[PDB]
């Protein structure tokens, strides 16, 4: 191993870039993983004074899938300075008018409530489409496993697996459906 003092330190205290993807996945687990990677918790030398972190890039933020009926229940409200500015926008409307805000607020609330929150948020980037700048693309390294497993529709199981699955009952031969 060896490694001189200054180079070894610069290597062990280096900033790595990661990549995350949505596409039919929940935003809670994605935001939790992003916060865990930004705060440096994933590393064995985690500490606030050390200022250890890693950039997190999320793509396809428009294809996020919520569980239950949160699309018409989660209200992302925010009061302004002037009176009567109590805005109570739902999740669907907030996503239609701004598809890069749900995961942003999730990661903002997940991260600790200290002055490092703004820095950790600035370290994070978001993109609502597959298009990513060349700089960030070249900066990306490795790809951690995805959270959800995707249910897989009927148009992907292939005919082989469909035929392998046996039937379960026998409808009448003269059933009008």
């Amino acid at each position: 191993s060896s490694f001189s003092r200054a180079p070894q330190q610069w290597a062990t205290f280096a900033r790595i870039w990661y990549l995350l993807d949505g596409k039919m996945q929940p935003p809670g687990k994605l935001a939790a993983m992003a916060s865990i990677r930004l705060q440096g918790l994933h590393k064995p030398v985690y500490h606030a004074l050390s200022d250890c972190g890693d950039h997190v890039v999320i793509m396809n933020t428009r294809h996020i899938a919520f569980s239950g009926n949160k699309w018409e229940q989660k209200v992302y409200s925010s009061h302004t300075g002037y009176p009567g500015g109590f805005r109570q926008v739902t999740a669907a409307q907030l996503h239609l008018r701004d598809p890069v805000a749900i995961v942003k607020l999730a990661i903002y609330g997940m991260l600790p409530k200290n002055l490092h929150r703004r820095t950790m948020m600035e370290r994070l980037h978001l993109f609502p489409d597959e298009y990513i700048p060349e700089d960030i693309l070249k900066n990306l390294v490795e790809e951690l496993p995805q959270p959800r497993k995707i249910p897989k529709r009927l148009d992907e199981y292939t005919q082989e697996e469909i035929d392998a699955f046996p039937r379960l009952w026998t409808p009448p031969e003269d059933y009008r459906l």
Partner: peptide, 10 residues
């Protein structure tokens, strides 16, 4: 303190 190689992000 490091004998089996100091830990690094890689």
């Amino acid at each position: 303190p490091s004998i089996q190689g100091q830990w690094h992000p890689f």
